[PDB]
Amino acid sequence: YTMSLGAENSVAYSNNSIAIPTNFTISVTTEILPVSMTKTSVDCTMYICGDSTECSNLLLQYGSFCTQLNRALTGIAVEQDKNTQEVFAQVKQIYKTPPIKDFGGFNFSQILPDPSKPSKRSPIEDLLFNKVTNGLTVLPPLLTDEMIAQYTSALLAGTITSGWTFGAGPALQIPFPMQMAYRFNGIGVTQNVLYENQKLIANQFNSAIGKIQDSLSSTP
């Protein structure tokens, strides 16, 4: 068939009519971004020739090709570690959440680390790790998965307990229903709207986080 771009929506434009929202939806969406690759190193002499000395003697006629290949692969390998360092190591303080998870009705259990798991990962992070499955060597990454999880845990604790203050300086504590009100003022909605409807917004946020986990678990 000929494809259809979208459903037609004739907006009811006139010179004296406006549409004002009377309600809101707290929507959580996923964005997946690759950060690093597998760090591969190739022994050029062993790949071309193995253990044959005559082959290596003939390979010496071609010069420093092997050195260039090894150096390019080494540059890629250090670039992967630099990429992980730039993405995850954006804080030099390891923040922790308080033992009491009283955030004014907001639930972060699906994104905070699970103490029951030995890997110290969140349920969402655990699901993400479960859903991803001759001279050649594979170098291990400089940051292990536990330390990357620790960095994400520190970022989550900072953004939950301190707002955006930890990204611009010292972590200044603020209650989470006040942080949310500040964010509401950032998008041009008054604080009263957040405070009056705090239970509904917390319920919507928890439902959206649960839908995110269900959608990741249910989509191949």
Partner: protein, 50 residues
């Protein structure tokens, strides 16, 4: 069939007509000794970067 490797005992049960063994990447990782019908794994020697 020649090569260099560490020949260890194998738990792979060959069928009686088969002599060599290959992995996904078409490299010989299992073999049968012709004198005594036993299965040997061929682990590559421990090459490394210094």
């Amino acid at each position: 069939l020649t090569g260099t490797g560490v020949l260890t005992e194998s738990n792979k049960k060959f069928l009686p007509f088969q002599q060599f063994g290959r992995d996904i990447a078409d490299t010989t990782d299992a073999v049968r000794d012709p004198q005594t019908l036993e299965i040997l794994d061929i682990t590559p020697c421990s090459f490394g970067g210094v």
